[PDB]
């Protein structure tokens, strides 16, 4: 059966090569390159007293949740820099945080192997744990709310899960990754999500069916960060091999490679601009690099963190970019 | 500011004060990453000090230790090992009576110790090495020689020399002048491993403080 698997993989790569008529670089040589994305730190969110592993923007593009090793889940008013909530986590070993699109809930998790769901809007003025999602046998590396009752989580146990928050049970388990899964990115329609894993592969998952629609293998090291293109027809991965890659869902192939020789460190976080022409990647070299997604040119650099940029997010209105980093700071950029 | 804006700012300031107080409380913690390989004495020394990550909290001689046990994380260690980059010390458990066992156990622990010693996040992190089950090792060393594990041993088959050879082989992979490896022999019946950890941690703090002044 191993021979059949090898034959099927050869057929898949030949089918990808057949559709690879013109590269994304070749087609995009006739579009105007964006000059220089010289964004500036509008806000500095101070208050985290340890490394920040995760931030997530609210859909209002004003609130954001950050997760730090200090055992605190802080919700920020990114406009006024106010702290809306300081959620103390039972496990301080958090590596992911999600903000529910409704705004009623945040999720977080990490080495405790639990996605903890926090109700931000209770009759009591405190934020408390609505649900602790247990069932992952590895650390949770990413979590994303589908809605108020559904959240998809990735884990170091090589699986992703879809949960019913009310019942607390895994509605679906997404197996197939052979390495630990670092990241998830939900599609805009939330019918399907991509996950990157330590097997250097990105898998496309159908949320309703629970099956791996496509598998993307371009990276040679662990994929730490994954992000959908704004239309949901493409996604960008970020791995430890110092490169970012753009994969098309329909073409089922890698389109663009975002690497520079003077960048040798790994990539912790990726995000797209609202139009998707900018790919913003956070690196271990302490700074975020802005990439022309269509042309793979470094459009800018978000230097300004004194440690590894571990997370970053673009607002839904596209106004701002937040960068969290291991230096315990979140920076809002414009 | 609006009245509501002023009260929101007041709430933010109260939050910041609580965060500062919590961080001040947390900075007094001695964080220890407990490591080992299965059948070593990890659980034994956790019981002596006294889900995916187990936190052991103990206070010894006015020093509060947070012992982080990551054994149940059967994952890629490098993906979360940086989460403990700031531990005072790694407490590494080796089963002495694992040279004659295979699952080779002692080579597995030796390679794990090498990887932890020379990990980039732990280049200057000292290690409290525990060589557990020294009584089982002494019982197994009079019958079985230390040749199944180490062929190039070429040494006496006595308990003292064999244990010292194992400890030397474990210390040989430090390759760092900043960090120290504090080795101890344990038997799961001894009740002084809390003192061993405390003494090693005080030595680590003293050495770091000397290093700051230029005296180390």
């Amino acid at each position, epitope marked *: 059966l191993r021979q059949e698997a090898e034959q099927l993989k050869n057929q898949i790569r030949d089918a990808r090569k057949a559709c690879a008529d013109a590269t994304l670089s070749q087609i995009t040589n006739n579009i105007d390159p964006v000059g220089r994305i010289q964004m500036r730190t509008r806000r500095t969110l101070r208050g985290h007293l340890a490394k920040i592993y995760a931030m997530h923007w609210g859909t209002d593009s004003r609130l954001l949740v950050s997760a730090s090793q200090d055992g605190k889940l802080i919700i920020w008013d990114s406009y*006024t820099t106010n702290k809306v909530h300081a959620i103390p986590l039972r496990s301080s070993w958090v590596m992911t945080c999600a903000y529910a699109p409704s705004g009623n809930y945040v999720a977080c998790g990490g080495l405790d192997n639990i996605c903890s769901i926090y109700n931000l809007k209770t009759r009591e003025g405190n934020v408390r744990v609505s649900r602790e999602l247990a069932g992952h046998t590895g650390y949770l590396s990413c979590c994303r709310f589908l809605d108020d009752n559904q959240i998809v989580t990735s884990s170091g146990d090589t699986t992703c899960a879809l949960w019913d928050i009310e019942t607390g049970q895994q509605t679906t388990t997404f197996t197939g990754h052979t390495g630990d899964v670092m990241s998830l990115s939900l599609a805009p329609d939330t019918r399907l999500f991509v996950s990157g894993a330590c097997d250097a592969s990105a898998k496309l998952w159908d949320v309703r069916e629970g099956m791996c629609r496509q598998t993307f293998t371009g990276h040679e090291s662990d994929i730490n960060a994954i992000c959908f293109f704004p239309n949901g027809n493409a996604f960008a991965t970020g791995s430890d091999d110092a490169t970012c890659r753009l994969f098309d869902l329909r073409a089922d192939q890698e389109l663009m490679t975002y690497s520079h020789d003077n960048i040798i460190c790994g990539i912790t976080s990726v995000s797209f601009s609202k139009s998707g022409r900018l790919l913003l990647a956070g690196y271990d070299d302490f700074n975020c690099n802005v990439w022309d997604a269509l042309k793979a040119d470094r459009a800018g650099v978000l230097a300004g963190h004194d440690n590894r940029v571990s997370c970053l997010g673009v607002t839904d209105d596209g106004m701002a970019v937040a960068t969290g980093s291991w230096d315990s700071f979140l920076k809002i950029w414009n | 500011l609006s009245a509501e804006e002023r009260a929101a700012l007041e709430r933010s300031k109260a939050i910041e004060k609580n965060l500062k107080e919590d961080g001040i409380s947390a900075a007094k913690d001695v964080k220890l990453l407990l490591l080992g390989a299965g059948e070593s004495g990890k659980n034994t020394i956790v019981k002596q000090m006294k889900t995916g990550i187990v936190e052991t909290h103990f206070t010894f001689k006015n020093l509060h230790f947070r012992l982080f046990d990551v054994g149940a994380q059967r994952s890629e260690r490098k993906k979360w090992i940086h989460c403990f980059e700031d531990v005072t010390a790694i407490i590494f458990c080796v089963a002495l009576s694992g040279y004659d066992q295979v699952l080779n156990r002692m080579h597995a622990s030796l390679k794990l110790f090498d990887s932890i010693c020379n990990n980039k996040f732990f280049i200057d992190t000292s290690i409290i090495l525990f060589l557990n089950k020294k009584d089982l090792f002494g019982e197994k060393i009079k019958k079985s020689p230390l040749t199944i594990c180490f062929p190039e041993y070429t040494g006496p088959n006595t308990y003292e020399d064999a244990a010292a050879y194992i400890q030397a082989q474990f210390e040989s992979k430090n390759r760092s002048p900043n960090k120290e490896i504090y080795c101890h022999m344990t038997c799961s019946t001894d009740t002084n491993n809390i003192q061993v950890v405390f003494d090693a941690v005080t030595d680590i703090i003293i050495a770091n403080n000397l290093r700051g002044c230029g005296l180390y």
Partner: single-chain antibody
Amino acid sequence: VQLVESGGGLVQPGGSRKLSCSASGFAFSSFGMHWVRQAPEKGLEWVAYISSGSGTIYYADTVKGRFTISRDDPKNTLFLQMTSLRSEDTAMYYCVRSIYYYGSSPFDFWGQGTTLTVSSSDIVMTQATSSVPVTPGESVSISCRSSKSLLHSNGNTYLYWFLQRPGQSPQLLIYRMSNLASGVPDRFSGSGSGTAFTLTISRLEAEDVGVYYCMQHLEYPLTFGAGTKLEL
């Protein structure tokens, strides 16, 4: 979530009493706390404010220096020490829950209140309509006026809508103009601009009968409109 006030009763003029409110069922220490009184026939009148953490205290200009507000966060109790109790101090005093952060709904929960009986630059909030006649199923638009633009440069319009149903506590309907409070059906609506605001009830039921109150929260001389009573 409940707020139970104690104290009250007949008091000689110029005397002193101390109203308390025994909060329970919510994170009392994280809420700012108000006293809002109401004469037996008149509208709501804000008394005083103690913020969460006690760092900020405000008083009504007509009570400042006389009344004293204090909270007991470990005891979950809010106090109002009253001195030199005038005849104007006869009213039902309501303890009002209130929390302030981005998106919060202040004035969302009100206590039952206690009656205190005494024997012998502020923004003007105007709602002239009173005793409006209604029938179930009809759409009514309660109007409200402000002496100063309630809109702030942050975009918020700090006008509140409360429903004082007969014999019970005021209940928040619209917290910041056009923001519907939790537990309030989406037949109530808030709208306005600048200084003029309207509370629209799409299809009113017999429960929607009561006295509807304005309240500005921009500067912090909290002033109410003269209640717009709706009756069947």
